[PDB]
Amino acid sequence: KPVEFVKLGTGVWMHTGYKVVPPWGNIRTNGLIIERGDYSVLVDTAWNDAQTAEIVAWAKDTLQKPIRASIHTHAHSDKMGGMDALHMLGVETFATDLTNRLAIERGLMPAKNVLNISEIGSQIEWEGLTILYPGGGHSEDNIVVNEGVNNILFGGCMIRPGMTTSLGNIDDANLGYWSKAVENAANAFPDSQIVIPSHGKPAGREILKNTAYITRPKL
Amino acid sequence: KPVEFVKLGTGVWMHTGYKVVPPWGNIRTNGLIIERGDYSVLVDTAWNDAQTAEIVAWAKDTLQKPIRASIHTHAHSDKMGGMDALHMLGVETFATDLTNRLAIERGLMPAKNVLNISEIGSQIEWEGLTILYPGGGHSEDNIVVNEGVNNILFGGCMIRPGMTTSLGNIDDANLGYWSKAVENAANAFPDSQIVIPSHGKPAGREILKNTAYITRPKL
Amino acid sequence: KPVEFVKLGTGVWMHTGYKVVPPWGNIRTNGLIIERGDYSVLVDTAWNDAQTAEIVAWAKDTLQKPIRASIHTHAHSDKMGGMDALHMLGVETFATDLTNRLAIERGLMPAKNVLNISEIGSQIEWEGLTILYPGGGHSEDNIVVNEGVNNILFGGCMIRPGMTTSLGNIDDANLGYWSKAVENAANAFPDSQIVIPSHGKPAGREILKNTAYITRPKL
Amino acid sequence: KPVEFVKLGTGVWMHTGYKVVPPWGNIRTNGLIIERGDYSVLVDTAWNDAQTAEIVAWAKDTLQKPIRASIHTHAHSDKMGGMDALHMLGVETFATDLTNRLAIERGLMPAKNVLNISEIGSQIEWEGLTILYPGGGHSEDNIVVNEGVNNILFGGCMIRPGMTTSLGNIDDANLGYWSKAVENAANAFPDSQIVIPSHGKPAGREILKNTAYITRPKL
Amino acid sequence: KPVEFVKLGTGVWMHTGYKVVPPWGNIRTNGLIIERGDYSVLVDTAWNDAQTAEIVAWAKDTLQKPIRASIHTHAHSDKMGGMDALHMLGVETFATDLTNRLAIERGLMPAKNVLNISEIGSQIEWEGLTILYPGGGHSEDNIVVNEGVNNILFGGCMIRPGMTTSLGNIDDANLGYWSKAVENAANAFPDSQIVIPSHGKPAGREILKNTAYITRPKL
Amino acid sequence: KPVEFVKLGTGVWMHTGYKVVPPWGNIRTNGLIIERGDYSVLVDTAWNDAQTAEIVAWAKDTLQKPIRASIHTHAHSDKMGGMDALHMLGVETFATDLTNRLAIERGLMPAKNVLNISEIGSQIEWEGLTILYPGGGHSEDNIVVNEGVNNILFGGCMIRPGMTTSLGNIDDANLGYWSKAVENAANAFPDSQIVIPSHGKPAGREILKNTAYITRPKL
Ligand SMILES: [Cl-]
Ligand SMILES: [Cl-]
Ligand SMILES: [Cl-]
Ligand SMILES: [Cl-]
Ligand SMILES: [Cl-]
Ligand SMILES: [Cl-]
Ligand SMILES: [Mg+2]
Ligand SMILES: [Mg+2]
Ligand SMILES: [Mg+2]
Ligand SMILES: [Mg+2]
Ligand SMILES: [Mg+2]
Ligand SMILES: [Mg+2]
Ligand SMILES: [Zn+2]
Ligand SMILES: [Zn+2]
Ligand SMILES: [Zn+2]
Ligand SMILES: [Zn+2]
Ligand SMILES: [Zn+2]
Ligand SMILES: [Zn+2]
Ligand SMILES: [Zn+2]
Ligand SMILES: [Zn+2]
Ligand SMILES: [Zn+2]
Ligand SMILES: [Zn+2]
Ligand SMILES: [Zn+2]
Ligand SMILES: [Zn+2]
C-alpha cells in the first residue's frame, strides 16, 4: 500500500508507510511531521528510503515547510529504515546515544546527533516537543514524544494498537519493565488525549492503559 | 469531562460522569434514569455530589419527571459517590443490606432503604424494573437491573466494556464466582439485547459473553 | 434474527443465519454464495433446513443463478445443519472424506461427494475456488476456501472474529496445531485482504494474525 | 499393585489401592481405618469391591477391630467404588445427602445413611472424628475428616499430592471455589500437621498451601 | 563433575556426564549402556568426546562387553556431542534420517546409519530394544527407547525431570505436539515403570504424566 | 516449633526459627552464623526477639564465638524481627541504606550502620563475606551473601524453596526484575553449589534456576 498523510492537529501530521511481511501481509508504521515557523521536523522514518523520500517531498511541496531535522524513537527498521534518504535530503537526524549504539548493532545507520536523555524519566525540550526516555519496553532504547500545543503523545512502538492482546515484535523487548515504562509516559503527559501507536490507528488514552495491562507481569 | 445524557430507549436514559484518575486519566461511569408516570427513578449516582446534582436537575427540568427514588448497584464511589446530593435533593435511596454494610465499611453513605435480595438468584420487581442479585463478581454485593419494556440490561461494573481483557478495579472482586454471576444474569434476562456496562459504551450481549470469558477460571 | 445477505465482491455474497443458544443468545453463522455463469455454488449451510432453504431460494429468485453444488468447511451444525434441505433442493454436496466421517460420528448427514484434500497443505481447484486443507484447528477436518477474483479468503470457524480472545466452541479443536493451520492458510493466500470468519463480521488479515496469536501455544 | 496398609498414628491406618488407567498407568487411592474400642471405622473404599473386601478382612484379622461403619468423602469411584463389598460385609455406610445424590447421578451406590453437613463450614462429630463440609473443590460434595488425637487431617481428593501443579481429574470440580475450600479446611484444623491426600504420599501442611495456590484463580 | 555409571537393571546401566553452562552451572545428561551377549550397545553420547571416550572405556574394561553400536535420540550436543569419539573408537552409530539431517543443520556429525522410523507411531526392534518415533516434542526428531526385559523406558530429553515446571531448552521444540508425543510413548510402553529423563534422576511414570501436563496446550 | 541449628560447612551454621501464621501454620525462616577467629557474625534475625536471643546465646555458649555484628538481607520481619534483641545484646547491625529506609516505612528498626551497595551489581567484602545487591526481586532492597571458603550462597527470600511454583509473600516484590536479579546472583557466584533460601531446605543451584523460571515474565 502507498504512503499516506493524515492531519492530527494544528501543524501535526501523521505519515504512514506499509511493508508486506509474510505470513500476515501489509503492516503499517506511523510517524509524525511537526510544523515549525517555515520548516518542519520529522518523528521517525518510514520502512525504507523510497517511502521516507516521499515524506520529505510532501513536507516541502504540500506543507511548504521543508523537513530540517528528525528524531528517531528506537533502533528498528520501521523507525530508522530510511536514514540514507534523510541524510541525502539534508535532514539533520537525532537519536539517543543508546539508540545509535543499538542501531549499529542491528545493522541500521545511526543518527548524526545525540539526544541527551539516558536516565529513566529524563526529558528534554527539542523543537517545541518534549522527549522522554521512560525506560525499556518494546525496545530498551524506546523514547516517546509529546506535542504540547495539541496535546498529542506519540508512543511509537512502545504503545500497542487498539484492543489487541498481541505484543508484536518482542525480539528486543524488556518484558519486565515495559508496563512501568508505559505508566511513566502516561504520568509524564496527563493532558494528552490523543495517543499515536506506530502499528495501528490514532486513539485515546485507552491504548496506554490497555498496553500497560497486556504487557504487565501477572500474579 | 462534563456530565452527558443519552437516550437508550423509550423512557430510558443513560447518565455519564467522568473522573480524572492518574495515570490513565478520565474514566467514565454510567447509570440510568428511568421514566415513570410523572416522576423518574435513578440507577446509580455519578462520581460525586456535583455530578449527581446535575443528573437530578436534568430529570426535573428536561424530562419534567423529577427523580423520586434510586437504586445503587454496589458499594463503590462511582455508584454511591453522590449520596449526600441525592439525600439533600429529596431522593429516596435503596440498596441491598449487604451493599449498605459494605458502604459503611468503605466510607460511603448507605442507602436509606433495603432491597430484599440476599440469596444468589433472588429477584424483585421495583418501580417496573427487575433487580437480580446474581452472586459476587466485581464486588460481592453487585446487583443487576433489567428494564423489560425496552429489554435493556444494566450490568453496571460487573460487566466489562467492549473487547477488553482488563478486569478493572479488582480490589473487592470475587474472582472465583464472577463468571458464574455473569452467566446467572444472562440466563435470567434472555430478551435483553442492549447491555450497559458502567465503564464503557452501551453494547449487546457480546459483552456478557466476553466478560464471562475474561473473568472465568481457566484450566 | 432472520437470514441476511450481503455483497462482498463481484459475484460473491455472504449468507448469515442466527440461532439462539443460552446463555449468550443469538449467534450468527456465515457462509458464501459464489456466482458462476448461469448458476451458483454454496459454501456452507446455515444452522437448519429452514434457513438453508431460504438461501437456495434467494440465489434462484434474486441472483437468478440457482445453487448447483456446495462445499462444507467442517462437520458442525452451523456448516452442515441444513444438509437435508440442500439434498431435497437438488444441490450436489461436497466435503472431505474426513469431514464426512466426522459428520456421521457427530449425527450430521455427510455430503454426497468427496473433496480429495487429505494431506496438510493439499489444495484443489473446485468451481473456480481454491480449497485448502491447512491441518486441524477449530476442528480436525476444517478446510478454507479462497476466491481469487476478488481475493476473498473464507476462513470459516477456524478464524475467530474481530479482536476477541475467546476460542469459541473448542470441543473438537486441535489446540496444538490450530495456530500453525492459520499460518498455513495465510501463507497459501497472501493476496486475500478480505477474510470471512463464520461467527463475526467480515474483516481483513488482522483477524488471521489475531486468531493465530490467541490460539498459539505460549511459553 | 496390591493393597497396602501403613500406620499413621495411634489407632490410625492408611489403606492404599491401585488401578491401572492408561496412559499413565497405576494410580493409588488412599483412605483410613480408625480404631475405636473393639471395632473400627473406615474412611473411603478402595477402587473396587475386591480391594475393599481386603481392607475389611485386614481390620478384622490383623487389628482385631472389625469395621462397623464408614464415611465417604465424595462421589467418585476411588472413594465409593467398593460400596457393594461394604454393604455385603455388614458395614453401615454414611455420606452427605449431596454425595448420595451425586453418587446416583454418577452410577455409584449411595451410602445407607446421611451426614448432616450441607452448609459451607458445617461440621459434625462422628465416631470421634470431625467431619467438615468446606465447600466445593475437587467435587462439589467433597468433605474432609479430621482425627484430633493424632491431629491427622484427611483431605482426600480435594488436596493434591506433593509439589505437583496438575489438578488431577477436574471433570466435576468447582474451579472457582476450590482454593477457598482448602483455606476453609486449613483454618478449621490448625493443629493437624499430618495431611493425607488421596493420590499421593502422606505429607504436612505444605500440601494444603500448595493445593490452594495451584487451584487459586489468578490475576 | 566427572562421568558416573549407575546400574538400572540387569544388563542396563545409566551413564551421566556434566557440563558447566552459566548462569545455572553444571547440567547432567544421561544415556544408557545395554549389555548384549559379549558386547554392548549405547544410547546417546555424553556432552563431548572426552566424556564419551570414558563411557566406551568403561564398557570395555568394567563390563567386559565393548560397545559395538549406538543410537542417538535427537540432534543436540548432549546426545551427539561425542560422535567423533564413537567413530574413532569403532562404534557403529545409528539415528533417524531426520536426526541426521538436523544434526548437519545444527553443526553436529550425523550417525553412519539410518533408523527407519519416519512416521508418527512407527517402531522398530534394534538390538533387543524397541525404538519409537512418537512425534515432535522437545525436538522434532526425538525418539524414545524401551528395554523390555527390565521394562525401562528411556525418554531422553522429551521427558522433563522430577516435578519441575520448566520446559528446558525449547529452541527446537514442537510446543503444539509435545504432550501428545509423551502420551504416544506412554501408551506404547505401558509396562515400563522405570523412566529415564536426560536431565534428572531416574523416576517412575509420574514424570511422563507431569511432563505431558506441563508441556500441554491449556484452555 | 523451637529454634534449630544445623552445620552447613566449616564455620558456617544455619539458624531456623518458626512462626505460626494462619491458615497454613508454621513457617520457617533461615539465616546464618559465620565463625571468624574468636567471634562470629550473623546473617539475619529470626522472627522475634526471643528467637534471636536464643541464636546469640548459642553462638556464645556452644560455638564459643560470640556474635559481634550482623547483616540483614531485606526489610521484612523474618529478617529484622529481632533487632531490639541484637541491639540489647551488643551486636553491631548493618544493612543497606535502602533496607534501613524501607525498615522505617514498614515499622521495623533499622540497622545501626550502612552497607554501601546501592547500584545493581555492586558488591563489597564484609567480614570475609561477599555481599551483592542484585537488583529488586522479592523486595526492592534484597541483597545476597556469599561465603567463599565453603562456597555457600545465602539467597534469603529472593530464592524460593525446592520445586515450588508459589511466589510467597509478593506484597513488596519487583515482579519485573526478580528473575534478572536471580540471574545476576547466579552469574556473580558460579562456584557456590550450596544455596540457602529463607523459607525451605538448603539445596543446590537447581533452586536458583527454578526460582528464576517461576518468577520470570512469560510470553
Ligand atoms: Cl488500531
Ligand atoms: Cl467500550
Ligand atoms: Cl466481529
Ligand atoms: Cl506424593
Ligand atoms: Cl530429577
Ligand atoms: Cl524446601
Ligand atoms: Mg548537511
Ligand atoms: Mg425526605
Ligand atoms: Mg439429484
Ligand atoms: Mg446390616
Ligand atoms: Mg569401522
Ligand atoms: Mg554497643
Ligand atoms: Zn520496534
Ligand atoms: Zn515497530
Ligand atoms: Zn465497583
Ligand atoms: Zn465501577
Ligand atoms: Zn465448528
Ligand atoms: Zn462455527
Ligand atoms: Zn474424585
Ligand atoms: Zn480421587
Ligand atoms: Zn535436546
Ligand atoms: Zn537435552
Ligand atoms: Zn521478605
Ligand atoms: Zn521471607
Coordinates of C-alpha atoms and ligand atoms in Angstrom, one line a residue, chain B residues 161-162 199-201, ligand 2:
Chain B
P161 CA -16.6 -2.9 28.4
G162 CA -16.2 -3.8 24.8
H199 CA -17.2 1.9 32.3
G200 CA -17.7 1.7 28.5
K201 CA -20.2 2.2 25.7
Ligands
CL2 CL -16.5 0.4 25.3

